[PDB]
């Protein structure tokens, strides 16, 4: 058990990019997906200024260099969690992409909550689901805002319950409590599809690498 854990769990933590997530994307791919388009300058959020490249005719432009760095970190974290077999829950209240996100979750073997987030799903989880339920080990927000342009209550609840949160934060979002913010465009279908594909690929790579490493260790 000791050696197994030491060589399985802690081995990947010794490498900058163990799962090679940087190859999954490039600044050009994000640009082509339009990850760099934000809302009007009037909708801008005070905490999203550091990630905004500028304002092109009252339209904010998200610094895709910072997006690339943040996306690297978020994808690496997600890959490591999937490798460690944690529960990854995808949250998004964008009804335009509810179906897509649910399908991505089902395909990648993780969970999704794209519906009306009932109060207490995380803070009252033991009562709602059962005393032995296992809460998600990572929450990935494809849209950190609810359908009234307020932060998803899941963000606050995840911070409360100490569940790390990856999250795509647009120029009108509040990245303060999101553990791994990925400044980007969460409203374009192209951008949302790119995010879904990236997270799906990273999680699948992590799971398959976990299986491969386990087989390598157990066969010897």
């Amino acid at each position: 058990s000791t050696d197994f854990n030491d060589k399985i769990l802690n081995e990947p933590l010794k490498h900058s990019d163990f799962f090679n997530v940087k190859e999954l994307f490039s600044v050009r791919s994000l640009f082509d997906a339009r990850v760099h388009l934000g809302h009007k300058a009037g909708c801008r959020h005070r905490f999203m200024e550091p990630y905004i490249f500028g304002s092109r005719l009252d339209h904010d432009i998200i610094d895709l260099e910072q997006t690339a760095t943040h996306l690297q970190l978020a994808l690496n974290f997600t890959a490591h969690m999937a490798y460690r077999k944690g529960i990854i829950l995808f949250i998004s209240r964008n009804r335009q992409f509810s179906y897509l996100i649910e399908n991505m979750a089902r395909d990648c073997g993780e969970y999704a909550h794209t519906r009306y987030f009932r109060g207490g799903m995380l803070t009252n989880a033991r009562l709602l689901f059962g005393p032995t339920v296992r809460l998600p080990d990572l929450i990935i927000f494809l849209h950190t805002l609810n359908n009234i342009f307020e932060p998803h209550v899941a963000v606050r609840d995840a911070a409360k319950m100490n569940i790390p949160t990856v999250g795509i934060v647009d120029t009108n979002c509040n990245p303060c409590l999101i553990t791994y913010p990925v400044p980007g465009n969460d409203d374009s279908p192209l951008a949302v599809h790119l995010y879904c594909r990236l997270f799906q690929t990273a999680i699948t790579r992590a799971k398959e690498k976990r299986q491969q490493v386990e087989a390598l260790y157990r066969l010897q």
């Binding site: 009804r95 335009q96 649910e102 794209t114």
Partner: protein, 86 residues
């Protein structure tokens, strides 16, 4: 008194529909504020009450114009739910 008669506030009836003529005249007086002015001048509105009423009407107009702007802005979003079910 010293002006010519039948030029001010005079409307000509078309085809004999005095009801339409009176409606047009009433619209004219109301838009010019004469009806409200007469109603308010029936009794003396003391200056403080007049100022309070003017301020209240200005605030009411600001609020109504802003609410109408919001309604007209959001009216487009009264479409059929495109993502019904999901």
């Amino acid at each position: 008194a010293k002006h010519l008669k039948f030029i001010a506030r005079t409307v000509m009836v078309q085809e004999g529909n005095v009801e339409s003529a009176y409606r047009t005249l009433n619209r004219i007086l109301t838009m010019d504020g004469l009806i409200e002015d007469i109603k308010h001048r029936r009794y003396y509105e003391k200056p403080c009450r007049r100022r309070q009423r003017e301020s209240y009407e200005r605030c009411r107009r600001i609020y109504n114009m802003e609410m109408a702007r919001k309604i007209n802005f959001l009216m487009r979003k009264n479409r059929a739910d495109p993502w019904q079910g999901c």
